Amino acid sequence: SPQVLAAVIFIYFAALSPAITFGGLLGEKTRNQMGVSELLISTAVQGILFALLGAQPLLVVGFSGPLLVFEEAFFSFCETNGLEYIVGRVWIGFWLILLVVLVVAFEGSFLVRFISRYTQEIFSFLISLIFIYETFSKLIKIFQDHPLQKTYNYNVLMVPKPQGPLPNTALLSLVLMAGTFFFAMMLRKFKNSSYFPGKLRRVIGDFGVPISILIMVLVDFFIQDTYTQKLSVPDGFKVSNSSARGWVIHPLGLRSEFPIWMMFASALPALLVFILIFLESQITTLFHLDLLLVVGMGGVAALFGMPWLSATTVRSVTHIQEVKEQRISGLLVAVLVGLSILMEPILSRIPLAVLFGIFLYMGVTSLSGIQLFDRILLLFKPPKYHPDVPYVKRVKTWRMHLFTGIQIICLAVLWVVKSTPASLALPFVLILTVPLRRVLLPLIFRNVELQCLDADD
């Protein structure tokens, strides 16, 4: 039916664009041990399995910001400790399977009340700040690799990568990032604007990210001489690093023996991954069986070097017979995402600057709905300009600013922990905001102030 096709196309694009961006980011961060190919095939397989055996087909599984942050932290930890990153991921997946087969007996569903708007907004703000910082750091790295000079060695080897500075690479990359961000934001505004027929305007606005990506890809395509770093996608179903690892990762070590102490100590990183996935599932949903399936599949996906995914409820806004239609649409979207690895010529001409502009746009748009962001903005507005909201009206302005400052201190502590070599503890530390709201904030604030500032809805 034509109804299924349009929704399938929309969801496929809205899942592929983040998938492509996160695959590029993962390939850059993890030295191409896990790239766009692995992320795409993992997303496809896990989406098919979740559609077939998921309680709620509305959920679509895919890589997210917190998972990328944890992958970067684990890669850095393995590099510092001289361990195999992929085998460590395999053992984390083993311990994740153990965790999911352990939680079912105890039914740890009472923790949902512990996670509140406090933790949810802190997590979302941290993720958006991480996105913005990653985009700006990539821009700085591009400008450092190819600085603005008057003389360049115009005969430089480029088979692995540019071995020296190049004239127009940095400025064109900055232009592409800025243009992608500007076009995506303008298309979003047009979707929220009052121009053009409503149906056509909404259709154009829904596809804002793919349209901006296509525009900037064409812009870079017609600039023939200038070199810009492109997305690294292998031709066919390949691991994107043949020298590094194969498809089926052998446990106990790939190039060197895996220590037993790491095998036993992989439980803690598995606990941190479970915490991250649980937090993402809670923020997307607002339930217990679907989380076990995703983490259980993530443990199996680690054996093949594939990443683990999360809940990421975005499909409900666009959407027994309805359940069957949703199941079929999700399965078709997953199949299309998997087959998107076949169009390697198309993906190999997508610059990384466009994807990082999309990353910045995603962070900026994620900042929009956060109440913590609203209060941070109110920190700069005069009190007369504060909106008519319960926390402004029923709480003193300095008390609300103190609440915002405490949340800012929490964000700063999380950022310091992430920058600290002990970045693997970033999930746990974030969950430490749960006792703070429960056992420490009531000491400073009152019940009414806490209810107004931190509310379920």
Ligand X SMILES: CCCCCCCC(=O)OC[C@H](COP(=O)(O)O[C@@H]1[C@H](O)[C@H](O)[C@@H](OP(=O)(O)O)[C@H](OP(=O)(O)O)[C@H]1O)OC(=O)CCCCCCC
Ligand Y SMILES: CCCCCCCCCCCC(=O)OC[C@H](COP(=O)(O)OCC[N+](C)(C)C)OC(=O)CCCCCCCCCCC
Ligand Z SMILES: *[C@@H]1O[C@H](CO)[C@@H](O)[C@H](O)[C@H]1NC(C)=O
Contacts (CB under 6 A) with ligand Z, residues 238-277: 241, 243-244
Look up residue 97 and give its two tokens: 């399977």
**Residue 294 interacting with ligand Z (CB under 6 A):** no
CB nearer to ligand Z: give 32 or 404: 32
Closest by Cα among 181, 214, 186 to 364:
181
Q: Going by C-beta distance under 8 Å and a sequence separation of 6 or more, which residues neighbour residue 412?
A: none
CB nearer to ligand Y: give 166 or 233: 166
The three-class DSSP label of residue 84 is coil
CA distance 414 to 95: 25
Query: Per-residue string for binding with ligand X, 257-296, x by CB under 6 A?
Result: ----------------------------------------
Q: Which does 197 bind (CB under 5 to 8 A by kind): ligand Z, ligand X, ligand Y, none?
A: ligand X
CB nearer to a second copy: give 152 or 428: 152
Closest by Cα among 172, 178, 155 to 227:
172
Looking at the DSSP bridge assignments, the partners of residue 230 are 351
Look up residue 268 and give its two tokens: 């803690």
Minimum distance from residue 382 beta carbon to a second copy (Å): 6
Q: Which does 376 bind (CB under 5 to 8 A by kind): ligand Y, a second copy, ligand X, none?
A: ligand Y
Tell me the angle at which helices 36-53 and 289-303 cross, rounded to the nearest 10 degrees.
140
Minimum distance from residue 200 beta carbon to ligand X (Å): 5
**Residue 428 interacting with a second copy (CB under 8 A):** no
Please, is 344 exposed, middle or buried when counting C-beta atoms within 10 Å of its C-beta (0-12, 13-18, 19+)?
A: middle
Residue 86 sits at the vertex; the CA angle it makes with 342 and 21, to the nearest 5 degrees, is 45
Closest by Cα among 418, 386, 417 to 399:
386
Instruction: Choose one: 24-32, 196-204, 297-305, 449-457; the region binding ligand X (CB under 6 A).
Output: 196-204
CA distance 50 to 60: 8
**Residue 389 interacting with a second copy (CB under 8 A):** no
Minimum distance from residue 356 beta carbon to ligand Y (Å): 11
Instruction: Choose one: 96-104, 118-126, 174-182, 416-424; the region binding ligand Y (CB under 6 A).
Output: 174-182
Contacts (CB under 6 A) with ligand X, residues 365-394: 380-384
Give the DSSP letter string of 225-263. SS---B----SSS--S-TTT--SS--TT-SSSPPPHHHH
Q: Which does 151 bind (CB under 5 to 8 A by kind): a second copy, ligand Y, ligand X, none?
A: a second copy
CB nearer to ligand Z: give 32 or 229: 32
Give the DSSP letter string of 305-373. TPPP------TTTT--HHHHHHHHHHHHHHHHHHHTTT-HHHHTTSBHHHHHHHHHHHHHHHTTT-HHH
# of chain residues touching ligand Z (CB under 6 A): 5
**Residue 215 interacting with a second copy (CB under 8 A):** no
Query: Per-residue string for binding with a second copy, 149-188, x by CB under 8 A?
Result: xxxx-x------------xx--xx-xx--x----------
Instruction: Choose one: 78-86, 99-107, 325-333, 405-413; the region binding ligand Y (CB under 6 A).
Output: 405-413
- Number of residues written out for the chain: 457
Please, is 14 exposed, middle or buried when counting C-beta atoms within 10 Å of its C-beta (0-12, 13-18, 19+)?
A: buried
CA distance 75 to 83: 9
Please, is 365 exposed, middle or buried when counting C-beta atoms within 10 Å of its C-beta (0-12, 13-18, 19+)?
A: middle
CA distance 277 to 427: 10
CB nearer to ligand Z: give 119 or 241: 241
Minimum distance from residue 84 beta carbon to a second copy (Å): 40
Q: Which does 17 bind (CB under 5 to 8 A by kind): a second copy, ligand X, ligand Z, none?
A: none
Q: Which residues sit at the interface with ligand X, rule CB under 6 A?
A: 196-198, 200, 380-384
Q: Which residues sit at the interface with ligand Y, rule CB under 6 A?
A: 139-140, 143-144, 147-148, 170, 174-175, 178-179, 219, 223, 376, 379, 383, 396-398, 401-402, 405, 408-409, 412
Q: Which residues sit at the interface with ligand Z, rule CB under 6 A?
A: 31-32, 241, 243-244
Q: Which residues sit at the interface with a second copy, rule CB under 8 A?
A: 147-152, 154, 167-168, 171-172, 174-175, 178, 194-198, 223, 225-227, 377, 380-382, 385
